[PDB]
Amino acid sequence: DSCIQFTRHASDVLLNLNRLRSRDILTDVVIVVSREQFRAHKTVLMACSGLFYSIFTDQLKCNLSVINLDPEINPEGFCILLDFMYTSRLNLREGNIMAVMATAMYLQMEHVVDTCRKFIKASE
Amino acid sequence: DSCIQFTRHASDVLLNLNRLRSRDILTDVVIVVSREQFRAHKTVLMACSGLFYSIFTDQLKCNLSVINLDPEINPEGFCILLDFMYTSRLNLREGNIMAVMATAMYLQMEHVVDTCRKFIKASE
C-alpha cells in the first residue's frame, strides 16, 4: 500500500495499556499464582503468551474471571514477566533468572526463554 | 533500573491485537458510524484516542456494548483510523485526507491531526 507509519505508535499504545493496568482500568481477569493475585487485561496476556492465547481462545475458559497457575510457578517470576508484557522491559537478575526462565517456558514466551538461555550460558 | 528491553515487543503485541481484531476475538464493543458497525477492543481504542479514553473511563459508558458516533463522522475516515490504531499505518490519500483529519480531531488523535495538517499545508 501507500500508507505512512508513525514509528512510536506501538510503544505509545503499550505505555497507555500499562497506565490502564496501574489504575486497574478495564482489567478483566485475575491470575492467581499461589498466595498472590495479579489483575490484567486478557487481550494483553494473549498477545504476549502462547499459554494465555490458548486459555482465552478456549470457548469455556474465555469466560473465566480467575485463572489459577500451576503451583510450581513462582509469584516473583510471574510479576517480572507481567511487567515485561506491559513495558518490553525485563528485570533479569542472577537471583531471579532461573524462576523467570521456568515461568517464561510455562507461559510460552519464546523471546524471554531465548535471552534467559543466553544469559545462563554466559555465566557457566 | 538494570532492565534489558526487547525492541520488537510493542510492535509484536500490536500485531497480535490486530490478529485478534481480524478474527473477532474478545472484541467487547461495537462503534456505530451511521449505517456502518466496527467491532473493537475498548482498551485499544482508549490507548489510541482521547475521546474513547474519556468514554470508557466514564462510570456509566464503560459498561456500554454499543457507542454511536456523531452523524457527521464519515465511516471510511473512521475505518482508516481504526486500522491505524491497530497497525501504526495510516492510509492517507488526497481523496480521504479531509475526512481522516476531521475524524482524528473528533477522536482526539493528536499525531494523526498533526500529519494531516502538514500534508494539507504542502498541497496549498
Binding site: 500508507c3 507509519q5 514509528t7 | 499505518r89 495510516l90 499525531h111 500529519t115
Partner: peptide, 4 residues
Amino acid sequence: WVIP
C-alpha cells in the same frame, strides 16, 4: 512519520 516514515515511509514503511
